[PDB]
Amino acid sequence: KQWGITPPISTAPATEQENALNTALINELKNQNLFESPAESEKRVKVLDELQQITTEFVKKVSLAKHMNEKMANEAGGKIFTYGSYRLGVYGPGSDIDTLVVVPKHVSRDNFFQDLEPMLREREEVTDLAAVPDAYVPIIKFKFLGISIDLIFARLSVPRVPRDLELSDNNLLKGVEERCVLSLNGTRVTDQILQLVPNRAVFKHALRAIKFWAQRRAIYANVVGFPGGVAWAMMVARICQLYPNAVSSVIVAKFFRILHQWNWPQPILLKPIEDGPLQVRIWNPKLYPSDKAHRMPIITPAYPSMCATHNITLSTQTIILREMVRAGEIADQIMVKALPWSALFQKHDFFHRYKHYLTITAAAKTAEAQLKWAGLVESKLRHLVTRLELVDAIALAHPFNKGFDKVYNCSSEEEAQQVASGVTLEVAYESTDHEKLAQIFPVYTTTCYIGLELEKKKGRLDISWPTQEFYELCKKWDKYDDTLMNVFIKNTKNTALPDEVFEPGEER
Template sequence: MSTNGAPTYLGVTPPISVNESNEREKLVTVSLMEELRRQGTFESEEESKTREIVLGRLASLIKKFVHKISLQHGLSEAAADAAGGKIFTFGSYRLGVHGPGTDIDTLCVVPKHVSREDFFEALEPMLRETEGVTEVTGVPEAYVPIVTTKISGIPIDLTMARLALSSIPDDLTLQDDNLLRNLDERCIRSLNGSRVTDEILRLVPNVEVFRDALRCIKLWAQKKAIYSNVNGFLGGVAWAMLVARICQLYPSAVAGAIVSRFFIIMYQWSWPQPVLLKQIEDGPLPVRVWNPRLYPADRSHRMPIITPAYPSMCATHNVSQSTQMIMTEEFKKGSEIVEKVIMGTTQWSELFVKHDFFHKYRYYLQVIASTGDPDLHIKWAGTVESRIRQLVMKLEYVDSLTLAHPFVKGFEQVTHCLTDDEVRDAAQGEISDAIAKRKKEDIEGKEGASVVYSTTFYIGLAIEPKQAGAVGPRRLDISYPTTEFTKQVKMWEKYDESAMGIVVRHIKSTALPDHVFDEGERQPRSALKRPKTAKGSGKSSNTSPDVPHKKRRLVT
């Protein structure tokens, strides 16, 4: 209750219920936590301590970095010492729902005289010289510029924001909106991760219940392959905000009850009604934000979930018609399973059964990105992946295609080739078992030998049933969306036709490579019918009368 006697609550509407959970809900919460432990979602105490040590070392390194740059800018030794520098964690680690081996999203806050160029040109070498650092990769041209590294085996994603301050005190917090004044958009985006995470934790009535429920939902979304912002599903922040909203609606419920109501409400939610954790207000900056009064201008967002820290943004702008349909179906299945769990007719383990993506469709698109250099490939494959959702949206306009289902990760291969023909085949995804087993030492010293690095992304194609009485073969013309996609990818400013390959082709499910399946997940190869070309080889054919049709393989 507030001081004037009026009821207070977290969220934009009053709670649906403030009643405590019943004994059955408390009991299934105990079994839920046991299942989450069996699933390996909690890290060991040893790894937890390692993370703390790594973050302490990183905090010291950032102060040394700021000190070094301060001296280079002519500051005195005393002023350089006072310049400070501080790190903030955000994402799953800050929320307290990280698991074994997951990375730590970390924000490096520096004073105004430290530039972004300094961050990439000076900090990267300092990281490489640091004991225990095994990997350092900078991506300055990313939407949120980032340095990825691994320290003592702990992966770190490091972003940077320079504030309009001459020094960064150790007790600095990022809650004050005025800190965003006079910052460029990249700094604002970098700060937003930490600010949003802290605001989510502030807006939930019971942090421990929120964490337990979110850990469950994250695991479920990962198992069902619907956890990926870049591919048009929901990312970690969006899932966290959805769970936080249910916690606001049931402030006294235990985690098992929150999970149960999460699926019911999400399946019944009237999209595009936005999910808001608090009322959105205009902030101090002339930056366009999502504003309820302007909502009609934002109807392109199919599942709007709005971040609670200024500047508020839609965390789900990548969601497409297809990915929304896929998530809605999973919400429905989840609600049915959890209802059975509450009734005692099934176990929590059923909720976490792995997806059936590679068994679900008869036809798939392969998008294959390839290069001959491992460092270049990281950037090229990432660029291609970031455009996959645009291919999905183009495919949604193809007649007779009811769904284009992108998978949430790519499959990487390193192929050791002896001839130009093998290089060409590897870039097109046609790698024989013999070549796939070849190792680095098998090609060393041999003339003309080279290595191909490739990443293959998959899109499942759902085709509407053949109409009753229809005769003859059907063709799906997907040449336009695939051609436009490859053109768009090649418009990347760093695209080099001589060093980068992009292939889009369709295959039947029977031609899927073994490495997309877990061991023992598919039938023995001999039991599968292989699609054949006119010559009878095992390569996929793009001219079969029944398969999605395009002109020929799109090969660069």
Template sequence: MTNDRGYLGVTPPISTAESNEREKEVTLTLMEELRRQGTFESDEEARTRELVLGRVSALVKKFVQKVGIARGLSEASATAAGGKIFTFGSYRLGVHGPGSDIDTLLVVPKHVSRDDFFEIFEPMLREFDGATEVAGVPEAYVPIITANISGIPIDFLMARLALSSIPEDLSLQDDNLLRNIDERCVRSLGGSRVANEILRLVPNVQVFRDSLRCIKLWAQQRAIYSNVNGFFGGVAWAMVVARICQLYPNAIAGAIVSRFFIILYQWSWPQPVLLKQIEEGPLQVKVWNPKLYPADRSHRMPIITPTYPAMCATHNVTASTQMITTEEFKRGADIVDKVIVGTAQWSELFQKHDFFHKYRYYLQIIASTGDADLQIKWSGTVESRIRQLVMKLEYVDSLILAHPFIKGFEQVCYCLSEEEIRAVAQGEISETISKRKKEDIEGKEGAGPVHTTTFYVGLAIEPKQPGATGPRRLDISYPTTEFTKLVKMWEKFDETTMGIVVRNIKSSLLPDNVFDPGERQPKSAVKRSKGAKSSNTSPDMPSSKRARTSNDPSPKDAPVKTNDNGTLPPIALTPVVETAGAFAPKESSGIKSPQLPFGENVAVATGAQ
């Protein structure tokens, strides 16, 4: 496990000292807190996962056999072709919790195509006993099928190897398996290969798992766990924890977690995180090389995977999400410093985020359809493009940052008319509609369900300069227009069945479903000045909801555009119009100079890699 210099990683450890008594004490309290937070699954759920994976393994072999017979193989040859599943992600790393999904890779022989994966395996999954919510996304960067089997969420990827059969003892760590396969298969194999390599490169697997379980909970609670939205994903968090374990090979979990926050906060980005030195692989294809790194400066917080082909696990990080993540590292460093000296509890580290209390204005992105299965694909497509919206918003004058929330909020409303359908798709859900049940609309003409997934982006606005007078205007029409054009470019987009609406909303008007039960709704930071008008300028909103701005062409008779063909409405754009003093952010988002609570030598810590 060590290199020829006697240590793991690309640089020597910062310290090889054993953890002291205080670090042992805080490790015990940390594990107690993790158990109190419910991060460990029950024995019953663990057994269910094992049973489900066993059944899935048998299904994969049946799938490969079925395709083989269809390709003209004999029954014996088709059966001998095998087919094998590998897990990766949190389940493979041993840090999954109750309700976590299982990332599963199907490895199949060369006679099975990717089309077979979606045209044959997906229908087989739909008919599989206990399977629900089956949805394939073949056009994804890494093509995927999601499903829920016996209450266990599973994500399926597929990799087709250039082999006539898949042996039961197959190891994916052999780089030569990547020969003569397409890029999508290489990407699909990457998850399992990286997880295996991470476990190989840490000095103590149990310490790594305990530490990573803590960091995952913290990142989820603080709403910074989402690769698709520009934060660190599961692989990135695992790699940085593994790197801290390499730097302190004899430390236990409490010590690893405390040093994690200290080092990550003052890390000299874009210096990359590397678990091992990456060289050119046996395929002689140019991969990431530290000497070539200056050409890749677009990566703001680079974390490079340790297997061939090396990739940046954090290429989605934007200027805004980097600022937010760094602030959370600072907060974490302050808290763990207090935990070590006994003036704070671990529970403070895991306090819930304040996203829906933090900003005065938010963008609300609503994806809607009338079909549950279609909604999964459509909302996923919209979510995957939100990072592009954030990047465009970052260029807007007076906008300090655009803060995307890490998940969408799903809702099903049962509507009796086209007018209600249109209103729901635009986020206007009355109490009557919200309480209506499915049986209330059955058999009624023109009635139907509307499935919506709503995403949010918090807007931190630059404070008004001293002495400035009059209202200011924050024009976000270009970023929002470009975003909706982008999502509508999806090859399966159908304006008659899919809706996309982008509008701004004040914090005081956020819907109840973004808050936990009993959580107090946010209040406006600044009262609206007398005579100030609503900033909702959507041409698709009902006239009773639409307010006029100084740029409206006709003060009295401007028509309200509506969609009269019975379809879900097209985009509603709402540039934010600001009245004097209304956009002062609630909290400063400036990043302060690094502070090292433990008095670590800055040069040593920043030079760790």
């Protein structure tokens, strides 16, 4: 069989040395503690079975509440799906479970918040329940027995959602709101990624390596213009198709070279782009100028096909390709036993590569608002880098979204507003992390960075208006409380970088 839309590059089996290196790669992954215990694996299956049970109870309640007869409420059904990194089977310890609840026609999005959310708060196993009703996609986040869940809603047009319902039928997209079809896409894409690889076990191991490399190099974030988890998976899936009989160590070594030499902006396709019954746009750079603008397009296989990497800016494209060339050189040294596998997962050098950094800090006086506020500021970083690209002096803006959390203990309430406004003065602070509590004057800050690459002379660095534009966008937030939340930007030279961004064994 031929996998993918292109004849393979090689169908040779794994050699003797590539099997030994494949074992040493899998061992390196275990040594980094990237696998959870089989206990917590069973625990996630237990939580999904509970949620599936709550789903049947939730749909039956809404059915009976709308005066449907008892027989049809039992037939009403409802099914829990999973997508993202859990459905792929490559997730770290403590990672979330992207979950989809699919309901029949008579179950409204109001029932998702006014009936299902009261059901989850009623249960003892659920903590940290936080529903955002004013989001573009309806989502409810909560911990079930300590396992973080992200639950999105999706109403169909079928009178009943049976338990054996597969989402492969494109006709099930008929008559559902264009909100709800994108929520179906998360599962339909993930199900198809597993169907299109020739070897699922080789794919999962290869993805776990590539994912860990991207996270260690801090190029694993679609919020700031890098490929997201779905994007990296479709990339690793493409190489599996091109080497259908290879082991994981081969897939990884060929992954970096094939992708930085790829003829961009030619898209990465796992299968031919489908047609469908809906009258909605499919990704076509020949028809839509916005699709034409995508620089490194990775196209999802589920109809309707879209570009998972539309956020990729000019800077972030340059950085993805730089990192692939770097990792390609390390991998080829690993495959000739010149280097161990641990070298491939050497952490980023973001705080050593530039002479000019931007410090972006979101501050709030209370820890509850700092969680919401620091997430708003992070979502506007991708616009700052694209705005900084429009500066003549700036050739590249490197976004670093691993926030650094501090808590400043000030004496006067005026000093609280003074440090929240950017005047650090000489106040004592302590480092913390995003695990919160739910004359003490607290100020909680989250610090991101943007590394600047200046243009070189052929034949003056003023970011005042991009900085001020950034403040207005953060403060246009519908939940911006001018009493608690603040945000400021500082020009930071490499020598003035704080000790927080360096580990004990690093230089400055």
